[PDB]
Amino acid sequence: KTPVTLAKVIKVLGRTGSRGGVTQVRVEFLEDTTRTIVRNVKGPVREGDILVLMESEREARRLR
Amino acid sequence: SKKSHKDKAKHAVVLDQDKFDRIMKEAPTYRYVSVSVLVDRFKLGGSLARVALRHLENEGIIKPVSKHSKQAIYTRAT
Amino acid sequence: DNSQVFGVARIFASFNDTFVHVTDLSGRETIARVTGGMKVKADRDESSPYAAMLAAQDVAAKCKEVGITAVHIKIRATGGTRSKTPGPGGQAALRALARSGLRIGRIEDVTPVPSDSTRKKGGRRGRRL
Amino acid sequence: FVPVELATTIPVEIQQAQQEIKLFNKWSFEDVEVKDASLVDYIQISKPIYVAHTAGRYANKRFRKAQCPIVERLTNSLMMNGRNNGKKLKAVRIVKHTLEIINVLTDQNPLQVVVDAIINSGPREDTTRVGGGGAARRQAVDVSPLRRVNQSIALLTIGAREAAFRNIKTIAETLAEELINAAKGSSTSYAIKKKDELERVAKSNR
Amino acid sequence: TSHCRFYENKYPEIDDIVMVNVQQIAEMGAYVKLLEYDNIEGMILLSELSRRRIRSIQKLIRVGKNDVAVVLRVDKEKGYIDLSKRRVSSEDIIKCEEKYQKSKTVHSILRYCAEKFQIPLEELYKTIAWPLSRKFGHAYEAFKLSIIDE
RNA sequence: CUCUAACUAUAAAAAUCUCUCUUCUC
Ligand SMILES: [Mg+2]
Ligand SMILES: [Mg+2]
Ligand SMILES: [Mg+2]
């Protein structure tokens, strides 16, 4: 099964990770834009970009 | 080092009458006719792949696309 | 009341291997015992939020098929003499139950509290890692 | 159509109605679409270019790599493994032959095939090495679309090079077969295989 | 021809034990062939590889040789196996290796018979070996009884 | 001359060290 969802990132909540490569993204689900999640992105990204996810409810904590 | 490939006859290099017949017959119905692809069927060593491949262009058995050296781009003649 | 068939979640959430175990509203008949360790392998993610999420989805499916629709949730830390703090998987399990269909009512903390008795494990100086 | 009077006459197909800027005067940048909405804005099929090779100031700001021509970026990333640094003309000839092959095999206007391949070979979940000393375990994150396209193009070119090394299939043929197998779900392609491995190892180490 | 499964199905089952041979270790670990079941690949990534701290990478893997293994997840669409080696207790490893020894021993005899009669090994396992393993728990014990009882 | 609200998720291991001391006055 492929329950991927597209979420448009609206805010970059700074950067985290051991070496400092992964970024906080506040994504907003393209379906039902009422909902917002924070997640962790490898690679550069700006506001307005969209992301593809398999897991949807996983709101992972800060990597450390 | 050691020859761990232990391959077969490393491709045929001398042509045979049946080989001639099969190249003439099966030149169409294979969209791509390039020296490496002719070699891929174990039939052609490669040195004559360009040579026989050129021979296919004697009464339009295969039509060209590009003629850059170090390759060949040929398609089945419609 | 439109016949919401109530049940109880009774979340147990420690620093290790959170538990989700639905019983009847009377707290006697088990439904969907499936635990934190069931759906994770490395045994380190036992307390991880994802473990709680997976166990929660399995419980949600079994609970919906048996018949319990609304679930009353109680979160239990390790309790007793041990550390008084809700497990990290508790929040994830609660959120996951909240999403997956089953309705929610009357969440309260059930973590036991002693009268500071039965001297806690560790010694005087305690864990000196 | 209107053979224009010139004292130096451009050949016909290079002259007639060039108000129709295209890739090689052979493949159309029109009729080219991206399936996913994730990789749009990071694939530059918007501007039609005569040669996938352009001296652009495309490394000054943070995201100027986004609007480089995708076919030009494929040419540029084709040159790898020292013995082939620079030599952009050879990479352009190789991509031209690959475009020819992508045309004649499975007609499917080749720009659509290459964009479909890079779309379906961009990994979406990767791992980072959060493990400090004791629990040296990697934890899963999801991938930015720019990282997706960059990793997909790198994976495609590296698989092409690995296939073509010390093999009779010319690098053009290997790159073309890589792109063709990537456009479909064919797990025979190196890029799709490694991307699937990455996604699955992310899923295992969520 | 040497091939075919040792157990009932081709795919390994969840939460079982196998013993696998290692051939290759790329970056994330070793995806390796199985010698207890069939011949497909299954991966051990580095997190579930060494019970001790990850100090020796090649010394504990020893490319080319066999080792106990435990299957965690199965993807019953394509042939992908998730597998580990840390998670086999000291009590367990001995029964693991005993089951492998039994499965390996039963293999060679039917291999000989299949080679001699040019019958696929799959057919011999389907016909005689599998019903014996159902009757007696294992086929080698069935052959030991065959020496005693016809 | 005027008012009490926001709260997070850190511990793998790391032992030892040979000379040689040289100064302040118009
Ligand atoms: Mg200490
Ligand atoms: Mg201390
Ligand atoms: Mg000493």
Side-chain angles (χ1 to χ4, degrees), chain A residues 2-64, chain B residues 9 11-78, chain C residues 2-129, chain D, chain E:
Chain A
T2 307
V4 298
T5 56
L6 311 193
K8 182 186 308 280
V9 56
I10 62 170
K11 193 185 290 183
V12 189
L13 281 154
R15 199 163 290 222
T16 187
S18 78
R19 320 315 168 111
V22 311
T23 61
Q24 303 324 90
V25 298
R26 183 161 278 251
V27 298
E28 183 178 1
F29 275 83
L30 183 62
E31 281 96 0
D32 182 79
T33 187
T34 62
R35 294 190 64 256
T36 47
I37 301 299
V38 65
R39 220 185 282 276
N40 278 332
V41 159
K42 200 176 207 158
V45 57
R46 273 189 295 108
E47 301 85 1
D49 176 82
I50 81 177
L51 272 62
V52 65
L53 274 298
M54 301 65 88
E55 61 246 40
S56 302
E57 283 283 359
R58 164 191 271 231
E59 183 178 1
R61 28 169 172 178
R62 164 171 71 121
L63 281 53
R64 164 191 61 280
Chain B
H11 286 107
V13 71
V14 295
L15 190 139
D16 291 331
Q17 275 277 43
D18 62 358
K19 305 302 301 273
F20 181 81
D21 179 285
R22 74 181 40 171
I23 301 299
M24 291 295 219
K25 157 77 190 303
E26 291 325 329
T29 64
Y30 292 166
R31 201 289 308 151
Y32 199 35
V33 177
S34 83
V35 298
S36 181
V37 176
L38 281 53
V39 170
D40 289 336
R41 306 290 178 274
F42 180 71
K43 51 198 183 178
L44 271 191
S47 66
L48 311 93
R50 308 165 308 282
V51 179
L53 177 146
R54 187 146 41 171
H55 172 62
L56 274 72
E57 270 284 9
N58 64 312
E59 292 83 3
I61 297 89
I62 53 173
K63 296 149 159 78
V65 176
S66 188
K67 49 209 176 187
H68 192 157
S69 175
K70 298 142 175 192
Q71 71 172 12
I73 301 299
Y74 284 139
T75 187
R76 50 159 193 284
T78 316
Chain C
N2 58 357
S3 79
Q4 295 293 293
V5 190
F6 298 157
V8 62
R10 296 182 65 86
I11 312 305
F12 176 54
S14 67
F15 283 92
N16 306 106
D17 213 8
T18 81
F19 273 83
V20 173
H21 179 99
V22 175
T23 61
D24 52 35
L25 189 152
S26 88
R28 193 168 271 287
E29 206 64 4
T30 71
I31 297 89
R33 177 173 187 71
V34 65
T35 77
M38 281 324 317
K39 300 302 193 294
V40 297
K41 299 296 183 181
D43 291 331
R44 308 288 72 64
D45 60 357
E46 272 165 1
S47 59
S48 66
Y50 197 64
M53 293 177 70
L54 288 187
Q57 309 322 280
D58 193 18
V59 175
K62 155 63 51 173
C63 182
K64 82 175 173 54
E65 70 90 18
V66 287
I68 296 100
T69 43
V71 176
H72 288 286
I73 297 169
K74 332 180 204 175
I75 292 179
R76 194 175 173 290
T78 300
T81 70
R82 290 252 289 265
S83 74
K84 294 302 161 133
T85 59
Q91 290 303 306
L94 188 153
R95 197 188 218 271
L97 276 296
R99 171 48 37 80
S100 183
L102 304 168
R103 310 313 295 262
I104 297 89
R106 280 310 183 281
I107 297 169
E108 72 305 348
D109 171 337
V110 67
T111 295
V113 298
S115 287
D116 200 75
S117 313
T118 75
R119 184 151 141 190
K120 174 193 231 173
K121 165 55 52 153
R124 175 152 197 119
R125 271 168 323 281
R127 255 173 63 78
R128 56 197 76 183
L129 61 83
Chain D
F1 191 84
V2 193
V4 179
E5 171 205 46
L6 281 74
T8 60
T9 300
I10 304 280
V12 193
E13 60 254 38
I14 310 184
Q15 192 174 150
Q16 200 203 57
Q18 260 39 57
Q19 259 35 68
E20 204 259 333
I21 296 90
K22 280 311 180 219
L23 182 63
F24 269 96
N25 276 316
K26 265 204 193 173
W27 330 121
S28 62
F29 271 32
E30 271 160 13
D31 291 331
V32 180
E33 71 280 5
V34 308
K35 303 233 171 203
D36 291 331
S38 60
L39 276 79
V40 70
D41 292 331
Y42 289 164
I43 280 152
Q44 206 268 330
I45 62 170
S46 307
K47 259 80 176 180
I49 304 299
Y50 291 167
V51 178
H53 154 273
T54 304
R57 313 290 324 287
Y58 293 9
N60 274 132
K61 297 299 187 288
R62 187 191 168 97
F63 290 5
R64 295 261 289 287
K65 285 186 292 183
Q67 58 271 20
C68 69
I70 179 61
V71 58
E72 190 277 331
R73 198 170 195 175
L74 183 63
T75 63
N76 182 20
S77 66
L78 189 152
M79 64 184 73
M80 281 325 317
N81 296 115
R83 65 142 213 249
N84 297 115
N85 274 131
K87 310 181 183 181
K88 193 134 177 72
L89 269 68
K90 267 175 54 193
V92 167
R93 296 303 293 179
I94 291 316
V95 71
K96 181 188 178 182
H97 314 330
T98 297
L99 280 150
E100 300 288 329
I101 292 145
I102 299 298
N103 165 40
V104 285
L105 267 166
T106 71
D107 293 298
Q108 291 287 347
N109 189 0
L111 277 296
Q112 185 65 21
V113 169
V114 65
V115 66
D116 186 74
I118 64 176
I119 286 170
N120 289 130
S121 285
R124 57 199 69 97
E125 208 181 38
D126 189 358
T127 60
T128 197
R129 198 151 72 266
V130 75
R137 54 150 151 170
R138 67 180 65 252
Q139 205 154 359
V141 304
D142 63 358
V143 187
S144 160
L146 186 65
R147 191 79 164 87
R148 291 183 64 214
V149 55
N150 303 324
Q151 208 159 287
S152 182
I153 190 167
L155 214 56
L156 280 168
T157 183
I158 196 67
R161 215 160 293 101
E162 291 216 350
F165 198 76
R166 63 165 64 86
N167 205 69
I168 197 60
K169 293 195 70 175
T170 74
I171 178 61
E173 297 208 32
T174 61
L175 196 153
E177 65 183 1
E178 201 66 12
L179 295 205
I180 284 293
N181 300 125
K184 58 204 172 194
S186 182
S187 298
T188 314
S189 177
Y190 177 92
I192 190 166
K193 189 178 293 181
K194 309 300 284 313
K195 181 266 290 180
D196 186 74
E197 183 178 1
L198 263 171
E199 291 183 354
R200 189 142 61 78
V201 75
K203 141 165 170 63
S204 73
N205 272 43
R206 289 265 167 79
Chain E
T1 306
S2 49
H3 65 274
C4 182
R5 277 79 74 187
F6 306 87
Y7 263 78
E8 174 168 0
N9 45 4
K10 63 164 296 185
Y11 273 35
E13 53 283 357
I14 309 164
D15 299 330
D16 62 350
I17 318 298
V18 286
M19 183 177 176
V20 298
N21 83 6
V22 65
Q23 49 282 50
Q24 64 183 357
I25 298 89
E27 190 276 331
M28 293 180 183
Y31 43 72
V32 299
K33 200 206 275 283
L34 293 94
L35 269 294
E36 187 86 67
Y37 296 167
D38 73 358
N39 287 284
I40 318 173
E41 295 293 328
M43 64 183 73
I44 297 169
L45 62 84
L46 294 174
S47 286
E48 68 287 358
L49 183 59
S50 284
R51 193 268 295 160
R52 189 176 181 176
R53 194 185 67 255
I54 177 166
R55 165 202 42 260
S56 69
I57 298 94
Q58 298 172 321
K59 153 170 307 195
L60 185 143
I61 207 63
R62 219 168 82 153
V63 58
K65 321 293 158 175
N66 292 256
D67 51 358
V68 180
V70 62
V71 178
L72 302 193
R73 298 146 181 180
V74 185
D75 183 278
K76 196 170 184 61
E77 289 181 355
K78 294 181 176 67
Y80 291 164
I81 301 299
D82 295 331
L83 188 152
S84 179
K85 203 192 55 173
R86 298 176 68 249
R87 311 221 294 172
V88 59
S89 182
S90 189
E91 182 168 352
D92 196 1
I93 62 170
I94 193 66
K95 83 191 77 203
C96 312
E97 191 275 326
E98 271 163 45
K99 279 170 86 177
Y100 175 44
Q101 192 94 30
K102 306 302 303 316
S103 294
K104 166 193 163 177
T105 56
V106 188
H107 182 74
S108 59
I109 309 181
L110 293 159
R111 181 272 281 149
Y112 151 78
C113 285
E115 158 60 60
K116 193 162 187 171
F117 292 102
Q118 295 154 348
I119 303 169
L121 268 172
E122 285 177 356
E123 290 320 319
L124 290 184
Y125 283 60
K126 270 172 177 143
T127 53
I128 187 168
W130 292 353
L132 292 174
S133 180
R134 310 291 290 101
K135 276 180 173 138
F136 301 103
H138 188 273
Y140 180 92
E141 197 281 342
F143 294 151
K144 294 322 281 153
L145 291 189
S146 81
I147 281 170
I148 294 168
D149 210 4
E150 207 172 30

